[PDB]
Amino acid sequence: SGFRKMAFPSGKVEGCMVQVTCGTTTLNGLWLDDVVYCPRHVICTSEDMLNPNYEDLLIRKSNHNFLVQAGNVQLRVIGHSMQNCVLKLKVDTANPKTPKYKFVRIQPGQTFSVLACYNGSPSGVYQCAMRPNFTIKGSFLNGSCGSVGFNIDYDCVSFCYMHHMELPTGVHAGTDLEGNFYGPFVDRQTAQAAGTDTTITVNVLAWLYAAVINGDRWFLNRFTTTLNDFNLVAMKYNYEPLTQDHVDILGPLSAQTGIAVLDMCASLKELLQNGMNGRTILGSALLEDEFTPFDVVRQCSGVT
Amino acid sequence: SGFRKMAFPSGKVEGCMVQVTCGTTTLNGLWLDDVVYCPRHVICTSEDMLNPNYEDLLIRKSNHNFLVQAGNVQLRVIGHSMQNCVLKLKVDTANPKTPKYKFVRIQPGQTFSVLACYNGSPSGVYQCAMRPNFTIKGSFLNGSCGSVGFNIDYDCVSFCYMHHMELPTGVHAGTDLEGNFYGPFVDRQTAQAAGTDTTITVNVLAWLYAAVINGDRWFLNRFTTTLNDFNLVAMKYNYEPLTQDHVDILGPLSAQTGIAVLDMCASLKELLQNGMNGRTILGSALLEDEFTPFDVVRQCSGVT
Ligand SMILES: *CCC(=O)N(c1cc(C(C)(C)C)on1)[C@@H](C(=O)Nc1ccc(OC)cc1C)c1cccnc1
Ligand SMILES: *CCC(=O)N(c1cc(C(C)(C)C)on1)[C@@H](C(=O)Nc1ccc(OC)cc1C)c1cccnc1
């Protein structure tokens, strides 16, 4: 037992981290097969960030201007192209450590692991969630750009995020591995305010199920509710609306614990209305929303 | 910016995880050089757990009774010995993925990363702290025994913990890599209650410094205190006493933020006495104590 904010083991992704330098800017790149993926803003200088014309800035760059270093050895760049907000640098050597992989674009509410890197070197790994406003609450300093988000299913790494920027509010924005930003963010130093960071209701319910499985049952009550009644309360507290799809996704957890999904919704409703009263659930004094129902099942069953 | 419960990248430790089977029990082992380390309770059956005589149980085991599998290939066991509560199985092949390593016995309050494994396969990584009562609040299911705790300094892995058991209260006990348990716990299925889980004061202060560095400053007040006054309050709230050694360890964070350690203690004192009032610090509604002052500096500086 015990429930922890757990990340996927990062080895498979560590073997893919490289350093990409263009001029004076150095950031992280992801080396899969003979391609290195990195944020296109690696070609930008001090001025450029404010109003960059990437197509124009890219004309002044040749293959030899992109310095790619994997460990302490240099990779030869034989081609370069821009796909949306990522640069793809074709190298002459396939990464011998390329795991089986996919590029996926996740939905908000979905969780993933981030391997935070600096100068192509991994510094740490943590578990994130794509917020409903398409930001991520990460831990990224200057030079962390190019660090990636991923999920692993046995031996296949599904890359879903690449770090590009920090908004003035200390939250983070990035793209999928096709270079498309999550949300409305752009890779320029301009006024970009995030929308309402609503709570991922289905994840809170999944984590309440994890708490019951682990023995924290004080919040379980004698009440039930309906999806419509629950959602009136959820709207009031800036919680995402709960749909029949979410109820279905929670089915295995409801089955394992014997607590009907709507009964857990009524417990969540009373927690929203009354607060925790100084109590904790799974060692937390707030309702945790960065565990999906899949994460709860995986962690509670020991999927390797 | 942003502050996350960050683990060390786990690749170097993933390359060391093996499966050890003795009879019907299968748990995890750590393969460094030509030795595989695992909990000695791998030799125990259903009955044995209650009152095991490990020296007697070990007499009935030969090298061929220990099945060690690294990936899908079997390792040949050429020697076996018991060192305290760990078994050391000498194999005929040195692990080609052995990183530079050390075995360290950490103090309570110190943090570390755990790579939770099942059948020698890594399932997840998370950051822990050795509690002042010598337990760890992990996430471990049956078969997780032999999973290890570690810290990394650039390229050297310092292994500090090996998982052995879960106490009836859902908390975890284990040993260092020399087989010595942390705390008074023993590897037998008996009444073993944990002591008071006090809060690691120096870690809470380090995390309050991390919050100031990241912009969460609402809790900063106009007060100061002394080590003796602060400690009277700390004792009342089951916080560990703060010593001059802890104040010295917080020096770099005090220097970076310009907030004297005793001033941060007075802020912590008011948080203990008044509570959070429904507010959060670094996205948490309670005072976090699983970040050491070294972790705060490492994360805030991007040590790779
Ligand atoms: C690796 C790049 C980097 O450190 N950062 C960055 C990103 C960019 C552009 C060209 C805008 C994509 O330029 N520098 C920064 C970052 O995003 N800083 C930043 C913060 C706030 C604002 O407000 C307008 C603009 C910018 C540029 C970074 C720092 C920490 C974490 N991630 C990224
Ligand atoms: C990998 C071994 C295992 O799953 N567990 C275990 C440990 C042991 C001994 C021989 C006692 C060291 O036997 N089985 C269990 C575990 O420790 N279970 C457990 C819980 C509570 C009590 O109370 C008396 C006794 C025992 C044996 C395990 C389960 C989950 C996480 N870690 C370990």
- The DSSP-derived string for A188-229 is SSS--------B-HHHHHHHHHHHHHTT--TT--S----HHH
Looking at B99, B125, B151, which one is the last position of a domain?
A: B99
Q: Which two tokens stand for residue B217?
A: 């400053």
Q: B205 and B185, same structural domain?
A: no
Minimum CA–CA partner of A213 in chain B: B170
Q: 3-state class of A142 per DSSP?
A: coil
Ligand 1, atom nearest to A48 Cα: 10
Cα–Cα–Cα angle for B271, B274, B279, rounded to 5 degrees: 70
Dihedral sign computed on CA atoms, order A145, A155, B20, B134: positive
**Which of B40, B42, B254, B12 is CA-nearest to residue B157?**
B12
Q: 3-state class of A157 per DSSP?
A: strand
Phi, psi of A266 (to 5 degrees): -65, -35
User: What are the contacts of B257-264 at 24+ separation with CB within 8 A?
Assistant: B257/B209, B257/B212, B257/B213, B259/B209, B259/B212, B259/B220, B260/B224, B261/B205, B262/B224, B262/B225, B262/B226, B262/B227, B262/B230, B263/B223, B263/B224, B264/B205, B264/B208, B264/B209
The CA–CA distances, whole Å, from A298 to A3, A210, B9 equal: 11, 11, 20
B71 touches chain A (CB under 8 A): no
Structure-derived torsion over alpha carbons of residues A185, A189, A195, A200, reported in degrees to the nearest 10: 60
For tokens 């034989």, name the residue. Answer: A78
User: B130 to chain A, minimum CA–CA distance in Å?
Assistant: 15
Amino acid, single-letter form, for residue B237: Y
Give CA–CA dist A257/A214, Å, rounded: 10
User: How far is C-alpha B129 from the geometric centre of its chain's CA atoms?
Assistant: 5
Q: B287 and B207, same structural domain?
A: yes
**Which of B160, B152, B166 is CA-nearest to residue B30?**
B160
Contact predicate B173/B164, CB 8 Å: yes
Give CA–CA dist B59/A6, Å, rounded: 39
Contact predicate B77/B69, CB 8 Å: no
Question: Contact A119/B11, CB-based, under 8 Å?
Answer: no
> Which DSSP category does A48 fall into?
G
Amino acid, single-letter form, for residue A231: N
The CA–CA distances, whole Å, from A288 to A174, A203, A215 equal: 23, 8, 16
Amino acid, single-letter form, for residue A50: L
Q: A114 and A86, same structural domain?
A: no
Q: Which of A3, A8, A10 to mutate to test the interface with B (most CBs of B within 10 A)?
A: A10
Burial of B142 (0-12, 13-18, 19+ CB in 10 A): exposed
The set of protein residues with a Cβ atom below 6 angstroms from ligand 1 is A 27, 41, 44, 49, 140-145, 164-166, 168, 187-189
User: How far is C-alpha A248 from the geometric centre of its chain's CA atoms?
Assistant: 23
Q: Please identify which of the residues B38, B41, B85, B246 carries the catalytic annotation.
A: B41
> Which DSSP category does A168 fall into?
T
Element holding A39 (H helix, E strand): strand A35-39
Cα–Cα–Cα angle for A251, A240, A297, rounded to 5 degrees: 30
Q: Indicate which technique resolved this structure.
A: X-ray
User: How far is C-alpha A40 from the geometric centre of its chain's CA atoms?
Assistant: 19
Contacts of A274 (CB under 8 A, 6+ apart): none
A71 touches chain B (CB under 8 A): no
Looking at B38, B73, B99, which one is the last position of a domain?
A: B99
CA of A165 from ligand 1 middle (Å) equals 4
User: How far is C-alpha B72 from the geometric centre of its chain's CA atoms?
Assistant: 29
**Which of B200, B199, B208 is CA-nearest to residue B276?**
B208
Q: A291 and A203, same structural domain?
A: yes
Looking at B99, B129, B153, which one is the last position of a domain?
A: B99
Question: Contact A2/B172, CB-based, under 8 Å?
Answer: yes
Residues from chain B contacting residue A170 (CB–CB below 8 Å) = 1-2, 214-215
Phi, psi of A248 (to 5 degrees): -65, -40
For tokens 């005090």, name the residue. Answer: B254
CA of A116 from ligand 1 middle (Å) equals 15
Helix A244-257 / helix A293-301 crossing angle, nearest 10 deg? 20
Q: Which two tokens stand for residue B172?
A: 């975890």
Phi, psi of B113 (to 5 degrees): -100, 145
Q: A118 and A4, same structural domain?
A: yes
Q: Which two tokens stand for residue A64?
A: 């030899």
Minimum CA–CA partner of B287 in chain A: A285
For residue B128, the enclosing domain spans 1-14+100-197
Contact predicate A268/A286, CB 8 Å: no
Give CA–CA dist B1/A213, Å, rounded: 35
> Which DSSP category does A242 fall into?
P
Give CA–CA dist B5/A114, Å, rounded: 12
Q: Give the strand pairing for A35-39 and A86-91.
A: antiparallel
Q: A121 and A107, same structural domain?
A: yes
What is the C-alpha R_g of chain B? 21
Amino acid, single-letter form, for residue B75: L
Nearest to B137 among A117, A283, A302 (CB): A283
Task: Based on the residue annotation, tell me whether B128 is a catalytic residue of this protein.
Answer: no
Q: Which two tokens stand for residue B135?
A: 């337990």
Contacts of B68 (CB under 8 A, 6+ apart): B18, B19, B20, B29, B31, B36, B74, B75, B77, B89, B91
Identify the bridge partners of residue B278 per DSSP, sorted by sequence position. none
Residues from chain B contacting residue A300 (CB–CB below 8 Å) = 141
Give CA–CA dist B97/A176, Å, rounded: 32
Give CA–CA dist B255/B297, Å, rounded: 12
Residue B212, domain CATH = 1.10.1840.10
Residue A180, domain CATH = 2.40.10.10
Q: 3-state class of A250 per DSSP?
A: helix
> Which residues 100-139 of A have a C-beta within 8 angstroms of B?
115-119, 121-126, 128, 137-139
What count of residues does chain A have?
Answer: 304
Count of CA atoms in the C-beta half-sphere (13 A) of B289:
20
Give CA–CA dist B173/B138, Å, rounded: 9
For tokens 């220097």, name the residue. Answer: B255
Q: A113 and A7, same structural domain?
A: yes
What count of residues does chain B have?
Answer: 304
Contact predicate B210/B296, CB 8 Å: yes
Q: A105 and A92, same structural domain?
A: no
Q: B138 and B7, same structural domain?
A: yes
Neighbours of A189 (CB within 10 A): 15
Q: 3-state class of A237 per DSSP?
A: coil
Give CA–CA dist A59/B281, Å, rounded: 46
B279 touches chain A (CB under 8 A): no
Contact predicate B214/B176, CB 8 Å: no
Dihedral sign computed on CA atoms, order A27, B7, A299, B164: positive
What is the C-alpha R_g of chain A? 21
Q: What is the domain count for chain A?
A: 3
Give CA–CA dist B172/A3, Å, rounded: 12
Task: Based on the residue annotation, tell me whether B160 is a catalytic residue of this protein.
Answer: no
CA of B217 from ligand 1 middle (Å) equals 22
Count of CA atoms in the C-beta half-sphere (13 A) of B273:
10
Neighbours of A258 (CB within 10 A): 8
Q: A177 and A54, same structural domain?
A: no
Q: Give the strand pairing for A100-103 and A156-166.
A: parallel
Contact predicate B9/A9, CB 8 Å: no
Q: Write out chain B in H/E/C secondary structure.
A: CCCCCCECCCHHHHCCEEEEEECCEEEEEEEECCEEEEEHHHHCCCCHHHCCCHHHHHHCCCHHHEEEEECCEEECEEEEEEECCEEEEEECCCCCCCCEEEECCCCCCCEEEEEEEECCEEEEEEEEECCCCCCECCCCCCCCCCCEEEEEECCEEEEEEEEEEECCCCCEEEECCCCCECCCCCCCCCCCCCCCCCECHHHHHHHHHHHHHCCCCCCCCCCCCCHHHHHHHHHHCCECCCCHHHHHHHHHHHHHHCCCHHHHHHHHHHHHHHCCCCCCECCECCCCCCCCHHHHHHHHHCCC
Question: Contact A171/B2, CB-based, under 8 Å?
Answer: yes
Residues from chain B contacting residue A138 (CB–CB below 8 Å) = 2, 4
CB pairs under 8 A between A and B: 151
Give CA–CA dist B2/B211, Å, rounded: 9
Nearest to B166 among A1, A126, A138 (CB): A1
Identify the bridge partners of residue A7 per DSSP, sorted by sequence position. B125
Amino acid, single-letter form, for residue B297: V
The CA–CA distances, whole Å, from B101 to A24, B27, B111, B128 equal: 35, 22, 17, 20
Give CA–CA dist B184/B193, Å, rounded: 10
For tokens 């760049």, name the residue. Answer: A77
Identify the bridge partners of residue A172 per DSSP, sorted by sequence position. A136, A166
Q: A231 and A191, same structural domain?
A: no
For tokens 């919704």, name the residue. Answer: A265
Q: Please identify which of the residues B38, B128, B145, B160 carries the catalytic annotation.
A: B145
Ligand 2, atom nearest to B48 Cα: 10
Phi, psi of B77 (to 5 degrees): -90, 115
Complete DSSP assignment for A94-139:
--TTPPEEEE--PPTT-EEEEEEEETTEEEEEEEEE--TTS-B---
Q: A241 and A168, same structural domain?
A: no
For tokens 């990035």, name the residue. Answer: A174
Give CA–CA dist A69/A22, Å, rounded: 12
CA of B173 from ligand 2 middle (Å) equals 9
Q: Give the strand pairing for A121-129 and B17-22.
A: unpaired
Phi, psi of A222 (to 5 degrees): -90, 15
